[PDB]
Amino acid sequence: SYKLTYFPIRGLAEPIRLVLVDQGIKFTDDRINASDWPSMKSHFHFGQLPCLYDGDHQIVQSGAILRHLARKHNLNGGNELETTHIDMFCEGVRDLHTKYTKMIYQAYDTEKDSYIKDILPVELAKFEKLLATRDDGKNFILGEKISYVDFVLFEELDIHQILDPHCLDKFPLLKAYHQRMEDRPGLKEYCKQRNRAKIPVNGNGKQ
Amino acid sequence: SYKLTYFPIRGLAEPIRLVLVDQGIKFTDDRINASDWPSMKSHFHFGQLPCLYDGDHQIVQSGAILRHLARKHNLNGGNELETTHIDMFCEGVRDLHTKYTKMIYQAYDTEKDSYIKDILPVELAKFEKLLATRDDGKNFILGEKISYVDFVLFEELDIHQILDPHCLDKFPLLKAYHQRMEDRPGLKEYCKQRNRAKIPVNGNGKQ
Numbered sequence: 001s002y003k004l005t006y007f008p009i010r011g012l013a014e015p016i017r018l019v020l021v022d023q024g025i026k027f028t029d030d031r032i033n034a035s036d037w038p039s040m041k042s043h044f045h046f047g048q049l050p051c052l053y054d055g056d057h058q059i060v061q062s063g064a065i066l067r068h069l070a071r072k073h074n075l076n077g078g079n080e081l082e083t084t085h086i087d088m089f090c091e092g093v094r095d096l097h098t099k100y101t102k103m104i105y106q107a108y109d110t111e112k113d114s115y116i117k118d119i120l121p122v123e124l125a126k127f128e129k130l131l132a133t134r135d136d137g138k139n140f141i142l143g144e145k146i147s148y149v150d151f152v153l154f155e156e157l158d159i160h161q162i163l164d165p166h167c168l169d170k171f172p173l174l175k176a177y178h179q180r181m182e183d184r185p186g187l188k189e190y191c192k193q194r195n196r197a198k199i200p201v202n203g204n205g206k207q
Numbered sequence: 208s209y210k211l212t213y214f215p216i217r218g219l220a221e222p223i224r225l226v227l228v229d230q231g232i233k234f235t236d237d238r239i240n241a242s243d244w245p246s247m248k249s250h251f252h253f254g255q256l257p258c259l260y261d262g263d264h265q266i267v268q269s270g271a272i273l274r275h276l277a278r279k280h281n282l283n284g285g286n287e288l289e290t291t292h293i294d295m296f297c298e299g300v301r302d303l304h305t306k307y308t309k310m311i312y313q314a315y316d317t318e319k320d321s322y323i324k325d326i327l328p329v330e331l332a333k334f335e336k337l338l339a340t341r342d343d344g345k346n347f348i349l350g351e352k353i354s355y356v357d358f359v360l361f362e363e364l365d366i367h368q369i370l371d372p373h374c375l376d377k378f379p380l381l382k383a384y385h386q387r388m389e390d391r392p393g394l395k396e397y398c399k400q401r402n403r404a405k406i407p408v409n410g411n412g413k414q
């Protein structure tokens with residue numbers, strides 16, 4: 001059985017949750033309190049969350065969790081080159097996310113607008129171009145078939161759209177793509193409920 | 208054929224160089240000097256390096272490159288769980304590298320000492336303990352069988368020794384582990400010659 005342990009925010013665990021929910025995989029979504037964290041901190045290999053318990057097995061590190069799940073549930077591509085392609089795209093999503101979190105925790109007042117104007121369009125052009133190399137950008141990252149990295153890019157697009165409602169206005173492939181991921185039947189309800197419960201994107205309440 | 212493009216520093220490409228040298232895999236080590244970089248930036252999927260061409264296939268992202276090499280050259284463990292363990296460990300190593308490089312680039316004068324004292328020992332103790340879970344940490348991360356992550360951890364330990372020569376003194380498993388990686392027939396003439404030429408660890412010359 002699965003138990004995902006993280007803080008009660010989207011942050012680094014959300015794409016993991018998205019994968020499981022969409023694919024109908026039962027898991028315990030274990031959102032801890034700020035207050036209980038200090039006493040569990042030492043239970044985890046690097047003293048951080050997220051953690052996925054697969055049976056007795058402790059799996060920390062969000063990337064290792066995603067790639068493990070990809071392999072257990074056939075969301076890792078159809079061959080060596082596709083697996084490599086999705087990992088490369090996944091890593092570029094995470095690189096954008098590191099720039100995003102930096103501005104959010106460290107410089108929201110002073111760097112939000114330069115982020116939106118000078119950094120984000122440059123970084124979205126890279127995803128737009130890469131997405132267009134499969135099925136002309138009209139289906140998933142690999143074209144015909146969905147893979148773990150589709151849930152990772154969706155979350156990243158979605159939180160950037162919260163930050164800037166017009167971020168995808170000039171990237172038609174990414175825009176239509178976000179919209180196809182959002183209306184997946186396995187997700188439509190979860191994202192509605194998440195939306196109305198006002199689940200924070202980040203630990204400091206800014207987004 | 209393989210061709211590895213990166214700046215003429217260790218930095219993010221070094222673990223990939225070590226994997227290939229050690230294993231006897233022929234590659235072109237394309238060290239591009241900084242002056243020529245704006246001439247080629249737009250040629251790569253994310254406008255960054257390192258890049259590995261495997262035949263005609265462009266592979267950016269150091270992590271995607273590593274795991275690609277792992278699957279292709281039987282350096283990714285013997286089963287699912289093992290693959291997940293080394294991925295977990297590798298991601299631990301990159302997290303310390305992110306702490307390391309922020310200090311190097313942004314705060315070498317002011318934070319080098321406190322990092323050596325307060326941060327670095329806590330982070331290494333995490334590696335010491337995880338290494339112990341397999342074969343009492345007496346061999347490689349997975350036991351008797353070497354894998355891609357050994358090369359990543361080796362590099363991260365080695366550079367940290369250049370920064371503080373005493374950083375492994377209180378970590379018996381990691382100390383011995385570093386020496387065991389350094390003495391591999393495959394990497395030692397390489398490490399001798401690398402040490403001869405005083406190849407910079409980082410792009411800003413600090414180490």
Ligand SMILES: N[C@@H](CCC(=O)N[C@@H](CS)C(=O)NCC(=O)O)C(=O)O
Binds near residue numbers: 012041049061063298
């Ligand atoms: N590289 C890790 C990062 C994990 C991480 O940064 N976790 C933070 C939350 S964003 C945490 O657990 N903080 C609590 C603490 O370390 O005391 C991953 O991708 O899983």
Ligand SMILES: N[C@@H](CCC(=O)N[C@@H](CS)C(=O)NCC(=O)O)C(=O)O
Binds near residue numbers: 267
């Ligand atoms: N996450 C990427 C990061 C690559 C990266 O940051 N590369 C920088 C230098 S270490 C670069 O190639 N060029 C800076 C630039 O032109 O933007 C990876 O792991 O490969």
